Each structure stands twice: as C-alpha cells, then as structure tokens.
Design a protein around this ligand. Sequence first.
Ligand code: COA
Ligand code: DSZ
Length: 180
Amino acid sequence: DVSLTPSGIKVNDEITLLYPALKYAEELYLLINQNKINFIKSMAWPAFVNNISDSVSFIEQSMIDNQNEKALILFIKYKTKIAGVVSFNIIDHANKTAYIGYWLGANFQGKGIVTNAINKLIQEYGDSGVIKRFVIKCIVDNKKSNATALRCGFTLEGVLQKAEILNGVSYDQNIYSKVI
Ligand SMILES: CC(C)(COP(=O)(O)OP(=O)(O)OC[C@H]1O[C@@H](n2cnc3c(N)ncnc32)[C@H](O)[C@@H]1OP(=O)(O)O)[C@@H](O)C(=O)NCCC(=O)NCCS
Ligand SMILES: Nc1ncnc2c1ncn2[C@@H]1O[C@H](COS(=O)(=O)NC(=O)[C@@H](N)CC(=O)O)[C@@H](O)[C@H]1O
C-alpha cells in the first residue's frame, strides 16, 4: 500500500496525515494560537495552550501514545501547511474500537479535509479488520461536527447526558458510530 509512507498516511494529492514530530511544534502552536478564541467554544484544552512548549509537550506525549497504540494522533497536512489534527483519541484493543477526534484551523474549514481524512482512516483500519467499531462523540450543539459524522456515514446511537465538561459546565454529547 503505497499510501502508507514512513512520514504518514497519504489521503489524496493534497492531504497527508503526518505522524507527529517535534519539528511540527512551532507551526502547530501558531495554528492553535490563531484559533484559540473559537476553539475554546468547543474543546477544553485550547484554553491552556500558552506557549510553544505546550505544543512540544503535546507532541512528546502523542509520540509515546502512538508508539504504544494507546492512541493514533496525526497532524493533518493540507498542501504545504499543517491544517489541524485527526486522531483515534482512544484505541480499545480488546473491543476493536476507536474513538475519533479532530479539529481544523478556520482557514482550513469548508474544504472536506476531515471527511476525507476519516474516510481514509476507516478504510485503512476498518477494511483491514484492525478496528470493528469507530465512534465520534461530541457536544450536541456542535453543528459542524454532527454534519461531519453524518457525511462520513456514521449513525447516531443516542445522547450521552451531561458527558462533557467545558469550563465547569457539563454538556450532553451525541454518540455516533460506524461499524465494519
Ligand atoms: C468539526 C470541524 C473539523 C468540521 O470542519 P469541516 O471543514 O466542516 O469538515 P469536513 O471535512 O466535513 O468538511 C465539510 C465542509 O467542506 C465542504 N466541501 C468542500 N470540499 C469538500 C470535499 N472534498 N469533501 C467533502 N466536503 C467538501 C462541505 O460542503 C462542507 O462545508 P459546509 O460546512 O459549508 O457545508 C471544524 O468545524 C472544527 O475544527 N471545529 C472545532 C473543533 C471541534 O469542534 N472538533 C470536534 C470536537 S467535538
Ligand atoms: N494540546 C493539544 N494540541 C493539539 N491538539 C490537541 C490537543 N489536545 C487534544 N488535541 C486534539 O483535539 C482533537 C479533539 O479532541 S478533544 O479531546 O478536544 N475532543 C474530542 O475528541 C471530542 N470528540 C469529544 C470526545 O471525544 O469526547 C483530537 O484530535 C485531539 O488529538
């Protein structure tokens, strides 16, 4: 499979999902910084990304988790730029289940980048039998994420009541799945 390269997974001519590396720390940090205000609306962690060193620490931990298959953290490269992150936040090996996460900088939204990335990951891990069940869980009012999940052929399984905390408040999540 020539799409599985040493540096990452080639989705198409424009998108590669890069294995994390320290060299990406600067670009990743700047991207988060540019999007911090909007990102804080939908994710907890951006509120605390204050220096490049925080992105270095994230990369270091992501590489450890990737090595041990605890997670699969990938940096989305669109053309020449890092666009965001797509991940299996959690890989449950016993139950062959992967929980998906993602984000894109504002300048990279509306381009199908995450949809294309997810479809590729599901082909690679799902059609090979490594993962049986893929899950997207996100706060109910996250309109763009809901659209992405449905666009990728996921099915709504239910609402997880008061399951995600942002800034001390618990919010309901939709849980979507795609089963091979
Ligand atoms: C969730 C998020 C990644 C969605 O980004 P996105 O760009 O809408 O994601 P997709 O890859 O599904 O792209 C779909 C959009 O690209 C457009 N489109 C353009 N080219 C396309 C292509 N090649 N394939 C599919 N759609 C394409 C679609 O029409 C759609 O645009 P629309 O929203 O104007 O209808 C983004 O809103 C984000 O990063 N949000 C903050 C982080 C977050 O909330 N993460 C999830 C935590 S719960
Ligand atoms: N410090 C950091 N720097 C850069 N990216 C980071 C990061 N911390 C996390 N991410 C990435 O942010 C994305 C979204 O992860 S998330 O934990 O904020 N939320 C969810 O997954 C929802 N679906 C809710 C749920 O799954 O319950 C993932 O791709 C992570 O790898």
